[PDB]
Amino acid sequence: GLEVATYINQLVPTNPTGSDLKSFGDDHLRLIKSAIKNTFPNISQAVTVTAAQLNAVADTTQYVKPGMVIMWAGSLAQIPAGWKLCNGVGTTSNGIPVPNLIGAFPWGIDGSSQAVGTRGGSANIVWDGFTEGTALTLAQIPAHTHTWRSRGATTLTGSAGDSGALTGGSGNAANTNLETGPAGQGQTHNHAVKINMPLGNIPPFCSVFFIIKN
Amino acid sequence: GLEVATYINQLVPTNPTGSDLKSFGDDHLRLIKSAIKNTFPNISQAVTVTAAQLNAVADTTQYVKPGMVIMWAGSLAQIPAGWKLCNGVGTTSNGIPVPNLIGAFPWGIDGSSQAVGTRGGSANIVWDGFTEGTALTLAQIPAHTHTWRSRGATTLTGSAGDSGALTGGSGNAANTNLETGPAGQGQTHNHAVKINMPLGNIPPFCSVFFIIKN
Amino acid sequence: GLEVATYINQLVPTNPTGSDLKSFGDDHLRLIKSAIKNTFPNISQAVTVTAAQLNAVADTTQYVKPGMVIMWAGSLAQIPAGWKLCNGVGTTSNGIPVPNLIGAFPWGIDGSSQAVGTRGGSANIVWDGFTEGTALTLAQIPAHTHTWRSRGATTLTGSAGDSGALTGGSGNAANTNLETGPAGQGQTHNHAVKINMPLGNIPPFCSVFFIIKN
Numbered sequence: 001g002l003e004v005a006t007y008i009n010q011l012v013p014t015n016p017t018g019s020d021l022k023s024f025g026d027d028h029l030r031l032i033k034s035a036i037k038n039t040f041p042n043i044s045q046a047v048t049v050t051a052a053q054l055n056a057v058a059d060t061t062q063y064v065k066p067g068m069v070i071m072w073a074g075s076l077a078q079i080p081a082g083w084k085l086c087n088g089v090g091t092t093s094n095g096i097p098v099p100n101l102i103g104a105f106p107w108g109i110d111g112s113s114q115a116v117g118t119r120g121g122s123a124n125i126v127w128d129g130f131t132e133g134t135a136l137t138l139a140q141i142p143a144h145t146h147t148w149r150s151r152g153a154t155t156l157t158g159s160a161g162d163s164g165a166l167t168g169g170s171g172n173a174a175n176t177n178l179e180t181g182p183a184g185q186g187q188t189h190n191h192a193v194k195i196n197m198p199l200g201n202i203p204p205f206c207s208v209f210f211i212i213k214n
Numbered sequence: 215g216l217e218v219a220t221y222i223n224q225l226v227p228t229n230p231t232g233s234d235l236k237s238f239g240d241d242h243l244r245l246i247k248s249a250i251k252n253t254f255p256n257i258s259q260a261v262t263v264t265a266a267q268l269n270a271v272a273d274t275t276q277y278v279k280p281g282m283v284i285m286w287a288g289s290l291a292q293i294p295a296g297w298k299l300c301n302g303v304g305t306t307s308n309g310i311p312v313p314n315l316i317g318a319f320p321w322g323i324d325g326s327s328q329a330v331g332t333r334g335g336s337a338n339i340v341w342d343g344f345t346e347g348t349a350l351t352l353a354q355i356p357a358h359t360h361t362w363r364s365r366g367a368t369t370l371t372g373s374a375g376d377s378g379a380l381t382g383g384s385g386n387a388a389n390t391n392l393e394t395g396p397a398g399q400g401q402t403h404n405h406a407v408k409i410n411m412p413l414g415n416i417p418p419f420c421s422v423f424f425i426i427k428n
Numbered sequence: 429g430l431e432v433a434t435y436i437n438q439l440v441p442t443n444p445t446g447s448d449l450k451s452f453g454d455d456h457l458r459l460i461k462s463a464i465k466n467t468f469p470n471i472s473q474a475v476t477v478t479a480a481q482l483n484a485v486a487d488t489t490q491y492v493k494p495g496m497v498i499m500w501a502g503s504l505a506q507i508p509a510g511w512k513l514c515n516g517v518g519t520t521s522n523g524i525p526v527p528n529l530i531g532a533f534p535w536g537i538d539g540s541s542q543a544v545g546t547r548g549g550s551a552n553i554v555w556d557g558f559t560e561g562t563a564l565t566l567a568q569i570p571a572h573t574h575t576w577r578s579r580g581a582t583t584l585t586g587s588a589g590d591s592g593a594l595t596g597g598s599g600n601a602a603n604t605n606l607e608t609g610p611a612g613q614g615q616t617h618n619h620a621v622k623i624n625m626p627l628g629n630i631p632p633f634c635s636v637f638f639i640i641k642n
Contacts, residue, residue, distance in 0.1 A: 009258040013248040016240050026444050028243055029456055034441040044437040045265035049272050051473035058477050061296035062277050063490045069285045073640055074495040074524040076539045082489035099287050099420055101536035107419035108315040111290050114421040121416035129621025131559055136570045136614030142350045146360050146574050147395040156584055156592025164370025164380055166392050176594055180394055180574035180608055186350040193343025193409050195621050200415040201628040202549035205535035206527050207542040223472040227462040230454045242457055259479035263486050275510040276491050283501050310502045313634055321633035322529035325504045328635040335630035345559055356564045360574045361609035370584055378584030380604050394608055400564035407557025407623055414629040426501055
């Protein structure tokens, strides 16, 4: 007979039976047209895709799920919709907090060594140098000599009966041109280093934005 | 005449010619309905997209290809389907080996300097401290002297006819209160360093997961 | 009446009124078929997706825009179409300049500290070693002594009345076996370091390509 259908899913593929009257046939035609106009109200051009391509839409693994992060080479004004700069401020659509990547690096973690989004390391933390002593040899000292000057007006008691003793009374120190044998030459005394070096050395980098999909 | 079609592609646009019998017209109607019901069996609501949007599905360059890798800001449990953690184990669908990114950084390469996925650099390789000696000056030595002591009971052979010589035999060393000239005062001696420092320094980073699309 | 329609959007859902002639009805049928054949020229199999999935195509937040950059684990030959190596050469389709990531690291910037694509830091900048001096103690000297050698034929003017002075003129240097008191033994003198160390120590990394979506 005749049925009420708004969308194509409600069409009855056997309704206009052979015994039905022709006076309703016109209505049937109208009905069919109506159905199409209620299912594709905006289609006006040719749809050239095939059935396989249309069925491929159902796959969702292709589509980018919320929560991924990317680095952005464009300006901040042209940031794509649904992506927020990874400033560490705010949460995503599902509530995951935005990580902070400003002036940092992506350090691959297993989720157990560090908490996700943890910021660590620095280019300049603390600095201190420290050597250690050198076992000096006799030649470590320079080619130095000790001048021999007898204190005051020294009168050495060397005669027949008294042993030779440089008995020097206080007074004008008689600087004789007497010298003692030089010792040492000023050789090389070497040390090791136990420097404190948390000063980080930044390798070559590039400056790019960081945006996480909302 | 009349045709039999399973899908809309087999509909004949000129079949019900003006010379055909009217008793077949009903059949035609049924046929049309059947065709639609076999081509869109799951469509029940309005489809508001336009032809251009539907034709855009054929474009695949925007679709993300297998083997792409990304940083994931969520937990390991909430990893999106089609992605595997960057543990360096296994291969992709097309056979690309999985690189290991745990505890590493993304080092941009041109494919000629290093092989893709190669792990280089380390936070601790080796260390050695090594200064060198200083060309010491005469004042490098501290304020030190050498006391004048005579070995044994040293007696000078100083008389009228014998040259004064402190000819001292073995005996009790009588140390007289004589002191030689001081040499030096202990000035500053500087060294340079030839340190061996491959011990890597960790710059600022952030802790995130890494997953590659299967 | 009868209308001229090429696509489904031009169909009049109320055209075949009840007062129209039967002789035109056949034409109506043809028209409908033609419309469908002109709207889906390539559909030849069942389309099992639902209305909601087709409607979801209109969303573009699901679509990765031109401009962002990704890192790639595959070979250079198998780079996906529409992606060009981030060699710093050229611009995108919308005009975003290509950053250079060869031998670089991703440095997150807020758009004010640095411009996009800025490169800094190096693996080998400069190196200088520099210790400092230490105030040497009196014990810093090694176990060294100075011999008491008398210049020339040294004779003391020691008589009964004349002060004993080792008045030694030039001549044969008479070396008496007299040794002055040794001082020091060469103990530990310690310093610090003020090394100039910008040579980059690259932390552990991995080698991955960098490609920008054109």
